[PDB]
Design an enzyme around this catalytic site. Sequence first.
Site, PDB file in Angstrom:
ATOM      1  CB  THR G   1      -1.079  -0.041   1.213  1.00  0.00           C
ATOM      2  OG1 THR G   1      -1.968  -0.802   0.892  1.00  0.00           O
ATOM      3  CG2 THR G   1      -1.539   1.485   1.414  1.00  0.00           C
TER       4      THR G   1
HETATM    5  B1  LIG Z   1      -2.021  -2.075   1.675  1.00  0.00           B
HETATM    6  O1  LIG Z   1      -1.102  -2.994   1.032  1.00  0.00           O
HETATM    7  O2  LIG Z   1      -1.580  -1.838   3.046  1.00  0.00           O
HETATM    8  C1  LIG Z   1      -3.595  -2.799   1.634  1.00  0.00           C
HETATM    9  C2  LIG Z   1      -4.377  -1.491   1.968  1.00  0.00           C
HETATM   10  C3  LIG Z   1      -5.764  -1.983   2.260  1.00  0.00           C
HETATM   11  C4  LIG Z   1      -6.633  -0.996   3.181  1.00  0.00           C
HETATM   12  C5  LIG Z   1      -6.448  -2.571   1.025  1.00  0.00           C
HETATM   13  N1  LIG Z   1      -3.600  -3.806   2.574  1.00  0.00           N
HETATM   14  C6  LIG Z   1      -3.614  -5.113   1.867  1.00  0.00           C
HETATM   15  O3  LIG Z   1      -3.651  -5.419   0.749  1.00  0.00           O
HETATM   16  C7  LIG Z   1      -3.754  -6.347   3.083  1.00  0.00           C
HETATM   17  C8  LIG Z   1      -2.532  -7.119   3.449  1.00  0.00           C
HETATM   18  C9  LIG Z   1      -1.577  -6.414   3.816  1.00  0.00           C
HETATM   19  C10 LIG Z   1      -0.609  -6.058   2.912  1.00  0.00           C
HETATM   20  C11 LIG Z   1       0.497  -5.228   3.174  1.00  0.00           C
HETATM   21  C12 LIG Z   1       0.560  -4.588   4.280  1.00  0.00           C
HETATM   22  C13 LIG Z   1      -0.320  -4.808   5.302  1.00  0.00           C
HETATM   23  C14 LIG Z   1      -1.494  -5.758   5.097  1.00  0.00           C
HETATM   24  N2  LIG Z   1      -5.014  -7.182   2.547  1.00  0.00           N
HETATM   25  C15 LIG Z   1      -5.904  -7.200   3.008  1.00  0.00           C
HETATM   26  O4  LIG Z   1      -6.378  -6.925   4.184  1.00  0.00           O
HETATM   27  C16 LIG Z   1      -6.658  -8.404   2.427  1.00  0.00           C
HETATM   28  C17 LIG Z   1      -6.202  -9.615   1.961  1.00  0.00           C
HETATM   29  N3  LIG Z   1      -7.095 -10.410   1.025  1.00  0.00           N
HETATM   30  C18 LIG Z   1      -8.479 -10.096   0.953  1.00  0.00           C
HETATM   31  C19 LIG Z   1      -9.058  -8.767   1.518  1.00  0.00           C
HETATM   32  N4  LIG Z   1      -8.177  -7.935   2.114  1.00  0.00           N
END
Ligand SMILES: *[B]([O])([O])[C]([C][C]([C])[C])[N]C(=O)[C]([C]C1=[C][C]=[C][C]=[C]1)[N]C(=O)C1=[C]N=[C][C]=N1
Lengths: 222, 233, 195, 195, 204, 212, 196, 196, 226
Positions: G1
Amino acid sequence: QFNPYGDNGGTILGIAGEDFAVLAGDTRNITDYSINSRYEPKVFDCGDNIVMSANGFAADGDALVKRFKNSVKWYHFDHNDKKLSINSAARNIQHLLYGKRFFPYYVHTIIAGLDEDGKGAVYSFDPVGSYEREQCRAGGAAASLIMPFLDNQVNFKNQYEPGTNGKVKKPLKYLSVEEVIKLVRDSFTSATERHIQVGDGLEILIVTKDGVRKEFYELKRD
Amino acid sequence: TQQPIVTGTSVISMKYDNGVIIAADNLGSYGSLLRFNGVERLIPVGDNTVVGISGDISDMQHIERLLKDLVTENAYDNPLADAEEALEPSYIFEYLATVMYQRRSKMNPLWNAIIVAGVQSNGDQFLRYVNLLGVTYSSPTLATGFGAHMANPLLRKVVDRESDIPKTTVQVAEEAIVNAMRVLYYRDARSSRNFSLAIIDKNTGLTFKKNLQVENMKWDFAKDIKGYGTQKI
Amino acid sequence: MDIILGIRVQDSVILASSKAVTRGISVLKDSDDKTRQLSPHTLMSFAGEAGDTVQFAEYIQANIQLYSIREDYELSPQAVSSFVRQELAKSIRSRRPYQVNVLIGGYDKKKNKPELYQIDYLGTKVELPYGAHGYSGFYTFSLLDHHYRPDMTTEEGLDLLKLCVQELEKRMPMDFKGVIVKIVDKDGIRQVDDF
Amino acid sequence: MDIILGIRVQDSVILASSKAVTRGISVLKDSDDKTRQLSPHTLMSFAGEAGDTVQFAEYIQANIQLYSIREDYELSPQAVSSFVRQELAKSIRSRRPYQVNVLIGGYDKKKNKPELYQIDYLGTKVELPYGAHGYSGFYTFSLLDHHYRPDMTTEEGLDLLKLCVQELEKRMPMDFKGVIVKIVDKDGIRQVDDF
Amino acid sequence: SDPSSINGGIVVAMTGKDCVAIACDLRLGSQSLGVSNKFEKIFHYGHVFLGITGLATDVTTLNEMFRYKTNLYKLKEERAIEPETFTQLVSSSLYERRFGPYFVGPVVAGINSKSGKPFIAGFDLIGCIDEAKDFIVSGTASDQLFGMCESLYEPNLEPEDLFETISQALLNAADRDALSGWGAVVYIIKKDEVVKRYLKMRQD
Amino acid sequence: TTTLAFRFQGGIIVAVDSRATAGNWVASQTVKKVIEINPFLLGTMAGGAADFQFWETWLGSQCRLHELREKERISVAAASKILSNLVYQYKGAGLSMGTMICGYTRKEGPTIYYVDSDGTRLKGDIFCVGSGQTFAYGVLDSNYKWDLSVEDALYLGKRSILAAAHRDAYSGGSVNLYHVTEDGWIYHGNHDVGELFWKVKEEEGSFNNVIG
Amino acid sequence: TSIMAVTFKDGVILGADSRTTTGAYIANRVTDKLTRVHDKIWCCRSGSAADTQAIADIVQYHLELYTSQYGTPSTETAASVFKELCYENKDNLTAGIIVAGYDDKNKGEVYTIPLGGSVHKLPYAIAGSGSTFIYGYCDKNFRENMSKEETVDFIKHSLSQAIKWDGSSGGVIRMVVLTAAGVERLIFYPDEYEQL
Amino acid sequence: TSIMAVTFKDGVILGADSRTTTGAYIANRVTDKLTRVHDKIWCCRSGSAADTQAIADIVQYHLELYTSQYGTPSTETAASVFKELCYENKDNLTAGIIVAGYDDKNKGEVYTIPLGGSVHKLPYAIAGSGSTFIYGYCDKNFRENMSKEETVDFIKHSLSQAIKWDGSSGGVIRMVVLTAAGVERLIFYPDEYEQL
Amino acid sequence: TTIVGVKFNNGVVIAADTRSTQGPIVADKNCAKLHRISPKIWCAGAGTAADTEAVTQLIGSNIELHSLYTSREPRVVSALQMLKQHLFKYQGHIGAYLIVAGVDPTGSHLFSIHAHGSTDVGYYLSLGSGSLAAMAVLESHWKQDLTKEEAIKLASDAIQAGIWNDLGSGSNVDVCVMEIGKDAEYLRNYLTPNVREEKQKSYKFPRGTTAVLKESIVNICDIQEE
Ligand SMILES: *[B]([O])([O])[C]([C][C]([C])[C])[N]C(=O)[C]([C]C1=[C][C]=[C][C]=[C]1)[N]C(=O)C1=[C]N=[C][C]=N1
Ligand SMILES: *[B]([O])([O])[C]([C][C]([C])[C])[N]C(=O)[C]([C]C1=[C][C]=[C][C]=[C]1)[N]C(=O)C1=[C]N=[C][C]=N1
Ligand SMILES: *[B]([O])([O])[C]([C][C]([C])[C])[N]C(=O)[C]([C]C1=[C][C]=[C][C]=[C]1)[N]C(=O)C1=[C]N=[C][C]=N1
Ligand SMILES: *[B]([O])([O])[C]([C][C]([C])[C])[N]C(=O)[C]([C]C1=[C][C]=[C][C]=[C]1)[N]C(=O)C1=[C]N=[C][C]=N1
Ligand SMILES: [Cl-]
Ligand SMILES: [Cl-]
Ligand SMILES: [Mg+2]
Ligand SMILES: [Mg+2]
Ligand SMILES: [Mg+2]
Ligand SMILES: [Mg+2]
């Protein structure tokens, strides 16, 4: 941590006839929930009218078969082109398997052929080398689905003769090569329905005095 | 026993009527960091074989040197090194397969998934897979990592079984591969837009394409997507 | 949890050793002799991990018998005990140590004295008037502390030994199926068949 | 505790229960009665974790005695066993379950039949001709399978029970200090003082 | 350790032409030790039959619980519960223990009294309904039963033929399982008659 | 598994079951758990093993080599000790086996040796090894006498395995009997438990608990 | 993110990528991480999608109820409600949230709320896994009182690099402009920002 | 640790911070991470000080023995010897090394060798914990065929940011210039590079 | 499990395979993964079977009561909000991975829900073990302004990709089409590409083959009169 073993799935089946023997096995190869190959031959002709299959971890399985084929070759060199009898081949395989007792070939080995009297012979092994001659043996992932069916339909277990009511058993009449193949095909069709690692194709190797013959049949690809 | 450090992602490949196609992106990832953007992961051996490697890049580079050394060794005392006794895909694969299995058996694996794509002396297509465990298998379509999950389904819609291979042209096959590479870019978090593609044809020989890019991407519909449910603005 | 006991009296050494052999859930045997004669006037009882015990006892036995033939001479109990200790002291820092505790009861024909040595698997040697290994001592030593004299006869030693076995049979949870008693004196080694 | 047995014969139920109480290294007692009378014609033996056993047995006893007073009527063995099972079935999903296995031997005065129920700590009830808990069954069931008849007399049942205890005394590693035998019949509950 | 294979046992159910069959072994054990050869796993509430494999204490508890609930159902509804409705009751009852479940493998079987339609259904331990047309399997030899049923079964079997099929499916599956056997029972169920048959099988 | 072996007037009886399991799955019902080591020596198997196929077949090679070298039948004590000394070298390495080396020689008479993967080597009159050993011991101890006929002794061994086959979930299939004299071991039938149980129940009046 | 909020002369702009990942699989390549808790108070979400949505939903509920009673809330008030949730439930939450809003009195404001639950008012803020790679760039290139066009270029270039290096970040660059003029949504596709 | 090597028109420049840390304690604030394996082949060291020193010492021994037999080695050769050690002993080493050298034929070359043991030839390279924060900056600001003065400013500004954000990095910025002219050492103190 | 959802011109379509698995064993060959929350709001479910069923029934029940309370046809966002808040409360322990779709007075809608309570919006979505095989197809063939006929084709093609290539998916394809201003049509077993071939042999036994000990009539009837 590194895990040196893996499960490539699949299922094999050996049935010994009166003057013949079959060694069948599905052609599907897998890891976890993915299909690697829909046609990856698992049962091999090893020479001297012996067919072999080492089901489980394909790398160990391919290694073992390769080494046995090699053992057959060196048996001919060292002993004046003598034909390796199925009982001798079985004992030789025990030593190949037990040679890695403390880092086993993670496979369920089955060989099929004819004994020195010309009668059908199937031998079954565990991963660490223990073996036993058997009339009937399924090995691999869907072995638990197939063996009970074979006890019932090959050895006529729990079957009795009508009218007597449990007193007289069903007689152990011999099965023809055509009759055996029907049981093999139905076993794999049934195994395919209820086991996700079984399907794609069924390859059967039939061993008679005339030689080794192959038959292939489609299986469901889901 | 080790852990992979700098890693290469999917290697995808398929057979077609006159030969084989293989492709792999030019990325060397360092965990979530997309560290190295110029890594070639398709390594040709002679004019009839291409070895595609995924997984640990340091181990890839080791394998690369073994193949380079294999060609040198094959040329020694071999007047037919560029003819009858030239290296075959089957020879190169079985060598690697021997090494991969030996290394796993010493509990010190080359942390890779390898695909040896090539064309034999007699014009037959060669396409076989081997990995860190020494596991080997062949199929009309082969793919590593994410490619296994996303590419194969697409490539199998073109060549679903052996009988579909003669019916598949190089133009149709290449298109399927290039589309698969785009799908992997959409959906693999450790992939890059830039990739290499190799075609080994029994007539036209080895065509090696560098600096390819995923193009014709669909992103416009993103503008219409707002919030995660109830949000309107 | 095998019980092996030893008591040095005026003119002899008495070794009591249980007869039971338990392999988990079942008592496989109730007539097992947990001792080996190392030389005509030296007896070693033993208790520890299965296999290791006999393997060790027989290995020691063979070595002392080899010495006896070579020199045409019986080693003193002290000498044999020292040899045994060294083997266990060597063993404890090995790849796979001998997990064996022993009592060495011998009659020294030179000094005309009985001698009892207690050696554990670590190679911890002690010369004692009475000894034991495992949980056996916890019950018996309090009785031996009370009743023991250095000038006791062999018959008095056996009576005191009976009192120890009775207390073990009363308070120990494990049924050790009684003991085989052996006496080591100037005339050699003999077994008390009725106990 | 260790070994509890039960055998239902023609006209009575016989419950044998060990006398030993071992707390770790020592046998603290060799005359312990591992049973409670729930009602005049219903006896429950028990074995499991220390404390839990008696606490449970007495809790059940109190409840059945309360029922007996309230209704001026003795519950059937089947009814008592069902009550007991429910208590254990309730117990197994509690914060701290009762770790107690029981045998309920009773004589049904309505049907004029002896009845033996085997219930483990999970609340697994089974009506049996002969039963046991723990490792006791492993030795005894093979003897009971062979010799048992439904038409046996009480004296024949006791003889078969002696044969079971002898086999336990031979092959079990733990000395359970013999058993207290109790008979449950139409005339009530009595103890066989000599066994 | 694994609750679903301490006591052991199996249940199988099949559909035929205007009939259903449900069958079970009789073994109750404490792992390796065989304890009882009279532990029946098939119960019935009116014309609705319920087989239960798994942890025996829960088998007993659930039987007592569904007896309880079907009895109150009958008093209020003024009619016997039907297989379709009971299946939903079983699912509800099991799911309410979602995070502390009964370690069981229930199998409903019976014929709808009004429509005459044969019905079978299976569940997992937390209430998921598997409403199969052909057959349902449950217990420690479920893999074996799947193998037998999948090969031996054919649709529209007559009651006396269906009996042979389900009996052989159970017997040969139980013989390839250490924790199942020690006798077997087969219920052949028709719209207004039910025959119960004890099978003679190997006692090891 | 249930395997027993006992000394008596007529020599030695050896009785074993036939079942092999992988967890709750019954792998085989037809397993030979007696290695016919040579014509004069027998060996049993038990314990999640079949390590003993390799090693007792190997033992037979060592026993053959002994009598080639020494021009004399190997003793039961010497044969058993070759095996016990071998497994002791491998101690710590794997799983849990247990065996009875049975034989009859001139100098020893009928002899049984319990050899064990932990290195244990015990001479004895009666032994039961395996997951169903306790069930077999029950029948054996209560009915054993030295003055048993060959016919009765064979039956006792058969019945003791049947008792264990019934109760023990990991024992069953069939009973393999052997009788050992110094003239050699004699095979006495493979007896299916499925048929043997109903036969014994009816004739003996035992197993009244079971309905038949 | 890769998320960021930047104050400028006319107000504030929120910026974010569109990648949601389950490990190395991209579960959603067109995610909207810029979410609305009030008319002109938005937030950038990083970390757990479930947690940040549950939080953002609750905050929007609190500010809607605040508005019904006490009129439009300050951006500080919104940040305080976000904090209260993140701080008091720190043991059970994985949420890195940047709050950004526009008052007429206070103009453009940016509050960052990292994992701990702490609040930090800043001229601009960067967050999410991909932010690590652009600390150097953003620090060097940020100026106060930038124009709208300069701030859009700053966010575009910054997130472009964050996307380039971070596997967890990618897809389109979404932006939301908060000024007196109103609320403007902007989107920038790979072909545009990759060649920068 | 913040280390980098950058090729330019006249050759190559190696740059590094001077901080050695035991956890949060700075064991040495004036460390020299730029070390010499040959006259005009140097390396930047990151990771374990013990491992990188042991490696660098061995490499210098190999190249000294190479020179005695076969004359001056190439920078590629030096990188290959570094690789051979890092790759074959990957299980027991924690060493991130950047090799940089100057030939007259090949001019300025830079090879980076991360943890795995892999080799990567690049125009410029960045490494060490503090490099994460300057991927964005370095990628945007790097040009090929820069001047000496431009390359010094590029390294100074880059490492300045790496130092600013990374706790493991700090102290003085050391640099080593490799050209045909010879070997020039440069140093830059906190007061100079912090205000940038 | 392979489940997909695809938006089109005048509505939305969802689809699913019919395989339920316990480890490597197929528990149900014709499982019903398409659940009805309300007449025109249907969702496809992956993960733990009991959970997808239970959580749908509960929300569907509360949605019905809510629809009766408000005198309005239920909205997809209501089902979405109610599901996600429920799933979030249980912190992922309710293993329900849902693709929620439907038509309501606001329009046509397509959402996904995960076990932990996160929601995603999209024109095309896929969940389950075969979601990667499905998403590959969707990414290759999806376009804007799909017709109803094209969307059903794309949806069922995505499910097939999972059926064939994913071992967790198999058997048949279920489809549900929810078009605006129309009744939602639930196409159970839309495709049946996995019918088992005829067996080589009949295993019908001769009567009296099984040994029997006892027979008896079971009294299923109530206590009788007279
Ligand atoms: B980002 O990469 O932090 C993102 C922001 C979120 C608000 C969409 N988070 C995610 O993609 C998270 C996992 C993660 C990745 C990197 C750092 C921390 C957390 N994904 C999920 O919460 C997720 C995963 N699979 C299905 C649904 N949600
Ligand atoms: B017996 O039950 O001990 C038996 C003896 C063996 C020589 C056949 N052991 C087994 O069947 C073991 C499992 C086991 C069960 C109970 C106690 C100890 C061990 N199984 C195997 O040895 C086996 C299983 N599958 C294939 C080959 N061998
Ligand atoms: B740098 O921070 O990576 C630095 C480079 C080294 C060559 C001087 N390494 C260290 O400071 C290491 C610890 C470390 C910090 C950050 C990442 C990886 C490793 N320090 C030591 O090796 C050390 C610590 N205490 C005494 C001596 N050496
Ligand atoms: B699919 O493969 O995700 C499918 C979707 C489900 C809604 C029918 N899942 C299952 O079939 C699950 C997989 C699973 C296995 C083990 C734990 C949790 C989930 N199976 C079951 O829920 C299941 C298992 N046995 C019987 C009934 N249902
Ligand atoms: Cl989101
Ligand atoms: Cl240093
Ligand atoms: Mg000591
Ligand atoms: Mg049994
Ligand atoms: Mg610093
Ligand atoms: Mg599939």
